[PDB]
C-alpha cells in the first residue's frame, strides 16, 4: 500500500512548485494534514473516511453514528498540526439512494459537527452499485493555524512526556480484522461484558477538539498524534526519537479480539488499544497537561521520549514496535 | 437521490451557526462550491468523484487519465463561483494496493494538476476489498475568490448571451447509462468512427481553467456553469430566468447512445451532449467572449437568457427542460 502509493506521493510532490510564491503554496511541514501558506496563517487540509465499519452498520441497520466517525476522523487529524477545525465536506459513495439510510446518517453528521465545532458546507453523493458494496462515507476538513504555532513534532526531544487520551472504543481502524474474526463465530448479537458485539463495533469515534484546543492554548506542546491506521506506529510520523510507554490494560473489544488469537504485537499495530490520541509535552507541563485533558476524558501518563531512536517499547507488555 | 439527500442538506445548513461571526463562516452564496468567509477573500471548496468510468479504465489496464477526470471535475466546479483553483486532496478507495494501477493513476494526476495549475497536497488511500469492487477516485479542491468578485448568477438578465465551450466527450456523467446500454450490446472493442467503445467512454474530462480565468479577467461575466450531473438542468442553479438555446449537432458517443433508444429530453438532462461548460455574458460582450474562449477550445454561441422563467428551450431539437 505504501509502496504502491510511492508514485502518487512522488508526482504529487512535483505539483508543489505549481503554487510556489503564490497564495496556496504548501508549507510542506508536518503530517496528518496538508498546510497551505496564506501569509499570516496556514490552512490545514485533511481527508479521511469511516472505513469498513459501515459494513457492520448496514448489517444491523444502525447508521445514525457513522457520520460522527467521519467527522471525528477528519477533525482529529486536523488537530495534529495544531489547527482549529472550521469546515468539512462529505463524500458519500453508495450502492443505492435509500432514504432511511440517508436520514439516519444525517443525525450523526449534525451531532459530530456540533461537538467538533465545524460547519458541514457541502458534499457529493454518488450512486454506484457496480463499484460500492454498501455506504462508503468519507470527507475532507479544513482548519486554520497561525504561523509559528504549527505543531508538527519537530520540537519533540528526548525526555519529553508522552500522555494518552482514552479512546471511546474501536474507533474506525481494525474493523476488517474484527469483522472477519468475530462475526462468523459469534454473530453480531453475541453479548460480551454487557454489550452486544455490534454495539462494541459501532461505538462512535471520540472527538478530541475541545481538550486539544484547550491544551495547546495553555501549555507548550511538542507533538500531537491521532491513533488511526497502524495504531501506535503513528507516533513514528511525529519524530525519529524513540518512545518508552506503559499502555493501559486490555479491556472491552480489544480483550475479546486478543482472546480470539490476535497476538499483542499485531494488536498494537492495528487497534488503538484504548488510547485514541497521544500528546507530547515538555516534562514541566506534564501535570497541567494531565489536568486539562482529564477534565474531558480519562487520560494516562504513558511514558517518555527517549534518546534511543525509532523504537516504541511498550514496557508492561514486553513489545517493541 | 435528492429526496434522500434532503435530510443531509437540512442538517448541514443547521451547522452554519457554529461558524457564525468567525473565520470560515459559510458565505452561503453561489452553487457549485461552498464559500468560506476569510475577510478580504472567500475560500471556495468543492467535492467531486470520477464515477463508474473507473470500471472501463480497469478493464483495459489504463488508469493513466482517471486522475485528470477527478481534477477536472473539481476545478471546473470551482470556476463556477469565479474562484481560481489552488490545491486538491484525493480520496482513493480501492480493492487492492495494486502498484500498477497506482503508478498509472499518478501519471494523470500530475498532468491534470499541471493543466489546472493546482497543487496536489495530500490524500487518503483506503484499501477495502469487501466494500469496493474496483478503484473509486474522488477529491476535494479549494480555490480563492476576492470579496465582490463572486460570480453567483444573480447578475444574469434577460437578453444576456449564452456561450458554450465544447466538451472533450462524455466527461464523467452518464457513464452508468452508457455502460449498461452499449457494452453488452456492442462489446468494449466495438469500433465507432475509428475509435473503440472503451476509448469513447474513457476520454478524459476537459479542464476549463485557463479559458475561464482569462474570460473573467477581460469581460464582465454574469454566470458560469460546469455541465455535470443533470446536463443542461445545471443552468437552473444560476438563475430563475429562462434560456433559449440551439445545441450543437449530436455526434460521437452521444449519437451512438441516441441511436440506441434514449430519448432526447433525457439525454440533455444526463449527458453534456458536446457542451462541457456554459458562460453567460452581456450581449454586447458576446464577440469578445467567443474570441477569448475560442483561443482554447471550439466554442459556440448557444442563445440568450429569456423571460420564460424556469424553462430551458432547446429550440433546434424541439425539447423544453
How far is residue A61's CA from residue A67's CA, in Å, rounded to a whole number?
Answer: 14
How far is residue B49's CA from residue A81's CA, in Å, rounded to a whole number?
Answer: 27
Q: Are residues A275 and A212 in the same domain?
A: yes
How far is residue B242's CA from residue B4's CA, in Å, rounded to a whole number?
Answer: 28
The alpha-carbon gap from B103 to the nearest alpha carbon of chain A, in Å, equals: 6
8 A C-beta contact, residue A81 and residue A145:
yes
Among B98, B115, B146, the domain-final residue is B146
| Residues β-bridged to residue A46 | A141
8 A C-beta contact, residue B280 and residue B156:
yes
Q: B259 CB near a chain A CB, below 8 Å?
A: no
Which chain A residues contact residue B101 at CB under 8 A?
4
How far is residue A191's CA from residue A157's CA, in Å, rounded to a whole number?
Answer: 45
Q: How far is CA A54 from CA A94, A207, B280, B317, in A?
A: 11, 18, 43, 45
How far is residue B271's CA from residue B252's CA, in Å, rounded to a whole number?
Answer: 12
State the best of A36, A124, A183 to mutate against chain B, taking most chain B CBs within 10 Å.
Answer: A124
Q: Are residues B44 and B170 in the same domain?
A: no
| Angle at which helices A209-216 and A286-294 cross, to 10° | 150
* B42 CB burial (10 A radius; 0-12, 13-18, 19+): buried
How far is residue B297's CA from residue B212's CA, in Å, rounded to a whole number?
Answer: 11
| Residues β-bridged to residue A139 | A48, A90
* Domain with A207 in it: 161-320
Q: A107 CB near a chain B CB, below 8 Å?
A: yes
Is residue B154 included in any domain, yes or no?
Answer: no
Is residue B153 included in any domain, yes or no?
Answer: no
Q: After which residues is chain A broken (C to N over 2.5 A)?
A: none
**Cβ separation A124–B138 shorter than 8 A:** yes
**Cβ separation A87–B125 shorter than 8 A:** no
What residues of chain B, 112 to 171, have a C-beta less than 8 Å from chain A?
Answer: 113-114, 117-128, 130-134, 136, 138, 140, 142, 144
| Residues β-bridged to residue A309 | A241
How far is residue B266's CA from residue B250's CA, in Å, rounded to a whole number?
Answer: 14
Is residue B155 included in any domain, yes or no?
Answer: no
What residues of chain B, 174 to 213, have a C-beta less than 8 Å from chain A?
Answer: 176, 179
Task: Provide the Cα torsion A302, A303, A304, A305; round to 10°.
Answer: -50
Q: How far is CA A185 from CA A54, A178, A190, in A?
A: 20, 11, 9
Q: How far is CA A283 from CA A194, A213, A307, in A?
A: 39, 19, 15
A140: Cα within 13 Å, side-chain hemisphere: 29
**Resolution value, angstrom units:** 2.0
Is residue A281 included in any domain, yes or no?
Answer: yes
Residue among B92, B120, B179 minimizing CB distance to A15: B120
| Residues β-bridged to residue A135 | A94
Is residue B281 included in any domain, yes or no?
Answer: yes
Quickly count: other Cβ atoms within 10 Å of residue B36's Cβ: 23
Quickly count: other Cβ atoms within 10 Å of residue A305's Cβ: 23
Residues contacting B141, CB < 8 A, separation 6+: B45, B46, B48, B71, B74, B75, B77, B78, B85, B86, B87, B88, B118
| Residues β-bridged to residue A313 | A244, A320
Q: Are residues B206 and B245 in the same domain?
A: yes
**Cβ separation B87–A26 shorter than 8 A:** yes
The alpha-carbon gap from B114 to the nearest alpha carbon of chain A, in Å, equals: 7
Place of cell 463495533: A201
Among B111, B146, B181, the domain-final residue is B146
Q: How far is CA B47 from CA A68, B147, B150, in A?
A: 19, 22, 19
What residues of chain B, 18 to 47, have a C-beta less than 8 Å from chain A?
Answer: 18-19, 22-26, 33-34, 36, 38, 43, 45-47
Nearest chain A residue to B133 by CA distance is A131
8 A C-beta contact, residue A150 and residue B47:
no
Q: Are residues A316 and A168 in the same domain?
A: yes
Q: How far is CA A157 from CA A165, A303, A315, B6, B213, in A?
A: 20, 13, 20, 50, 47
The domain that contains B87 carries what CATH number? 3.30.1330.10
Paired sense of beta strands B84-94 and B135-146, if any? antiparallel
**Cβ separation B119–A26 shorter than 8 A:** yes
End-to-end CA distance of chain A: 19
**What domain count does chain A have?**
2
Which chain B residues contact residue A6 at CB under 8 A?
102
Residue A284 corresponds to which cell in the numbers above?
A: 514541566
Place of cell 453534456: B272
Q: A8 CB near a chain B CB, below 8 Å?
A: yes
A13: left (phi over 0), alpha (psi -120 to 50) or beta: alpha
Residues contacting B43, CB < 8 A, separation 6+: A43, A142, B24, B35, B36, B142, B143, B144
Among A120, A146, A172, the domain-final residue is A146
How far is residue B65's CA from residue B203's CA, in Å, rounded to a whole number?
Answer: 8
Handedness of CA A36, A42, A45, A46 (dihedral sign): positive
Residues contacting B252, CB < 8 A, separation 6+: B169, B193, B200, B274
8 A C-beta contact, residue A151 and residue A216:
yes
End-to-end CA distance of chain B: 19
8 A C-beta contact, residue B317 and residue B232:
no
| Residues β-bridged to residue A48 | A139
How far is residue A43's CA from residue A146's CA, in Å, rounded to a whole number?
Answer: 9
Amino acid at each position: 500500500t505504501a509502496r504502491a502509493l510511492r508514485e502518487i506521493i512522488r508526482t504529487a510532490r512535483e505539483t508543489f512548485k505549481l503554487r510556489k510564491g503564490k497564495v496556496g503554496e504548501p508549507g510542506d511541514i508536518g503530517h496528518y494534514a496538508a498546510l497551505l501558506d496564506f501569509g499570516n496563517f496556514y490552512l490545514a487540509m485533511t481527508t479521511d473516511g469511516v472505513g469498513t465499519k459501515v459494513l457492520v452498520a448496514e448489517a444491523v441497520g444502525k447508521f445514525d453514528t457513522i457520520g460522527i466517525d467521519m467527522i471525528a476522523m477528519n477533525v482529529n487529524d486536523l488537530l495534529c498540526v495544531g489547527a482549529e477545525p472550521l469546515a468539512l465536506v462529505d463524500y458519500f459513495a453508495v450502492k443505492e439512494p435509500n432514504e432511511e439510510v440517508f436520514k439516519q446518517v444525517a443525525k450523526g453528521l449534525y451531532k459530530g459537527a456540533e461537538e467538533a465545532g465545524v460547519a458541514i458546507v457541502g458534499g457529493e453523493t454518488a450512486v454506484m452499485p457496480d463499484l460500492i458494496n454498501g455506504y462508503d462515507l468519507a470527507g475532507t476538513a479544513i482548519g486554520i493555524v497561525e504561523k509559528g504555532k504549527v505543531i508538527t513534532g519537530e520540537r519533540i526531544r528526548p525526555g519529553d512526556s508522552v500522555i494518552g487520551i482514552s479512546s471511546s472504543g474501536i474507533h474506525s481502524n481494525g474493523l476488517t480484522l474484527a469483522r472477519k474474526l468475530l462475526i462468523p463465530k459469534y454473530g453480531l448479537d453475541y453479548e460480551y461484558e454487557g454489550r452486544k458485539l455490534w454495539e462494541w463495533l459501532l461505538e462512535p469515534t471520540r472527538i478530541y477538539v475541545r481538550p486539544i484546543l484547550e491544551l495547546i492554548n495553555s501549555v507548550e506542546v511538542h507533538g500531537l498524534a491521532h491513533i488511526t491506521g497502524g495504531g501506535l506506529l503513528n507516533l513514528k510520523r511525529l519524530t525519529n526519537y524513540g518512545f518508552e510507554l506503559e499502555m493501559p490494560p486490555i479491556e472491552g473489544i480489544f480483550k475479546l479480539i486478543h482472546e480470539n488469537g490476535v497476538p499483542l504485537d499485531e494488536m498494537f499495530r492495528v487497534f488503538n488499544m484504548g488510547v485514541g490520541f497521544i500528546v507530547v509535552v515538555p516534562q514541566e507541563e506534564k501535570e497541567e497537561a494531565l489536568e486539562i485533558l482529564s477534565r474531558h476524558y480519562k487520560s494516562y501518563e504513558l511514558g517518555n521520549v527517549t534518546r534511543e531512536l525509532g523504537k516504541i517499547k511498550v514496557k508492561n507488555y514486553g513489545i517493541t514496535l
